[model samples]
Target: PTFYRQELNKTIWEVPERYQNLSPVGSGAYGSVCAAFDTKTGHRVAVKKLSRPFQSIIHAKRTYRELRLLKHMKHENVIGLLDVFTPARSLEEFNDVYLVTHLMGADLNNIVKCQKLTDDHVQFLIYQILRGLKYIHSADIIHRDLKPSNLAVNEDSELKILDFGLARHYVATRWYRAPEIMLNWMHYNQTVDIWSVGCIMAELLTGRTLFPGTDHIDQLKLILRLVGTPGAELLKKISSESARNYIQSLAQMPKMNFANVFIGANPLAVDLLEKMLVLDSDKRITAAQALAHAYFAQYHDPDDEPVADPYDQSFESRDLLIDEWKSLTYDEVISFVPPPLDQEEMES
Candidate 1:
């Protein structure tokens, strides 16, 4: 369900005239990101207009919720929200607001969908992703959605973590969610991020969803096939009676071994894989812990780590021109290169 629609007013369009709408870059259930041009500055920007009025406290709170995590985010792997505006020129033309950010290039979902990613490419992505999550977790923010679609590659070929819309301060989405979230284990921490990191890693390696389930029950089966079912007593301690009942059926599941799945894989890769897909969330490696895993320790070089974000700390709030949005479509959705065509011999 698109729950945010109920919380926002959509009767009017509230964008400023200075931000001229150019073309539509993307549209989602929550809102649409439009390509726009700035009248005064001659710059392009991506304007994300919500489906609701901005005057409501709920609307403002949700905006702030995203801002708090992305405001100062300066990682090579994370997308930074360049600025936010309720846009008041005369102060009366307001109806809604726009979320402005630097245009991140293509996301990962399309890549996997179209191209065959080599192991090296997969490893590179994982390294950058962990680096980004490490930075966010350092600030105590849990990125609820870490799927490939939300990850963007910038012009510099830098992998950036994009989209904080579903980002929540608390543990959320028990589906892609960690065991901690599933069991209502509070005291929010970075361990939750490891779960997503694991899921992404699996997708990258296999080019398929390890837990492709339509619902929670189906998802549980997928998880059990890989990690086995939890014990009845332990499951009861962690989840509700319904969850416990599901766990009781664990014995019915056939065992599928992983040894043949990732054959000839690096031990570090195997280690990281096991740590993530393990049955117990408490046992699942935390983000901080994963940083030290051999997968990272053996491969990541020290000089590769940037001491700071290249963007200015205050740049997140700087006003961008509406014209800046033009670049959002510079390249077609990134994935595959078209076939090379040969010119016919000159007939002359």
Candidate 2:
């Protein structure tokens, strides 16, 4: 399969005339991304080509929902949607979507695999993720997908959460997915993200995937073995009969000691993980509560946490038809204005 799309034509894509030096930086199942120089702003930015965004109704809705959320969210720890556009000068030609964003040094997945993280590094990175999650949940937005690859960071340790298209879906890397998700629960909340954070924190502490399950069933087994089976009371709360029966049929397992699992981790850190990786969603610690934990005592400062978003009450979730999505997105593209020419350049 072609990993990248054909070259983005300046005329066809309507990329700002002043943008220069476009070069492919990354490609994925969805589409290709390029690093480019914005001559007007004198800053490098990331240009994402949403491959076949209008390929089907599902694709179109996902594209519109993501764009809508990005349009409303403004947080230092969340990736900013600088602008959006399309090459189509008319509705008939509209088939592609282009999103412009800040260029980052690397993603957390790459950093985890290639570099050795110290205790301080792990603490700071996780702190930033939770901070970002706190902001997102405050807006009543569930970042259903929270994996290392979706998180971008700089050399200075600044991190931002990106990729909000999958918020309405539970799809996540098997290893990082929460148990409640694996059980196919009818409804879930922001705590699903905390489960993923626990998995990430464990991986960072031990420098490897904490629960590398082969499949969905195996994934549950791995978690049960490590975290120990949930009590009978909690098991009864499982909404799916088959899943609940299967879990009940299994032998009761003893909980594993975090001290032994994480060879050199602090006791406080292990306690925090215990709170986050709980089998019951109601038992899990919230992102805001996690920030106040003693595990992050040295890093926590009340003033540094983002103030409660007043815009929280104003955010809304609405369902739109494919044509309506097209109209709304097209309006965004046509109305987008490039930065003022005389505006002073700001450091990232």
Candidate 3:
């Protein structure tokens, strides 16, 4: 491990010789972030290290999928993977993961705290996120995480999503949590992101966290209050009979109209939110469909949005053998060709 790994700021960085000048950026429960200078490419990059790749089955699945998923996606609004490297020399040595992406300005959450966003800013930010999202969905890859922090933004409002792998129900961020992913509903899909967009729209309007649910039960109640108790059909995907029984026990609440709930918000934006916040994914507006909504009349330029070739979604089947995954992943890493070095460097 020491052959390629470098000790930087008390953490072991097992990256290629081309990457250097490592410095800490941030860290969270899933992983830590560091800013590194890629000498070969002569550009700065963000290296996200998953310290516990094998700690949880959920973590391993997502980490592996992300390494593979980011390998192919390239959109203006989506965070593209510049390079990827794994520390483990052999299948047995594989434990940590490192993914390199373009280092940009602060994330959406920091910007939200610092500035008072105008209608133009809100519309543009939402538009770009949807554009990126639509492109991702075109590839048949569902982005399970779309919270503010996950969307890195520059001063120009360009967005790129992180944590776009698979769903991590329990440990995932709760306030932005969708019902199905939380309920362990059978037909979980990209509409989960629509729920996130719906909630994020509310936060954009109110400048406060929406659906700040203290617990899973509280999160559902918060969502239920806003969207009301769904029709009996909502239970169709409630694969967990035990989970179904809990929802059946709830007192059906009345759905609050968006106008009443998000008063002072624009009528058109509210209309789009209503379409997205549906309790049923079947009824929810898709990112592609949402992009054309009347709410984005000014910024929804048909020509500017990008679409991607459908990705190879081969992970839908099979569970895991950590060693086989390690081997396959190593195969991918060895086969990787570095992206074009013509990408822009951020201005100070």
lDDT of each: 0.57, 0.76, 0.78
TM-score of 3: 0.85
lDDT of 2 by residue, 177-208 (tens): 77767667766788999999999999988888
Please state every model's RMSD to the true fold in angstroms.
12.0, 4.8, 4.0
Candidate 3, which segments miss by more than 4 Å at Cα?
1-6, 28-30, 40-42, 52-63, 86-97, 167-171, 240-249, 319-321, 343-348
- lDDT accuracy of residue 330 in candidate 1: 14
TM-score of each: 0.70, 0.86, 0.85
TM-score of 2: 0.86
lDDT at 43, model 3: 80
| lDDT digits (tens) for residues 119-176 of candidate 3 | 7778888888898889888887777657887788875777777667555432657687
Q: Candidate order by TM-score, highest to lowest? A: 2, 3, 1
Angstrom error of the Cα, residue 248, model 3: value is 4.1
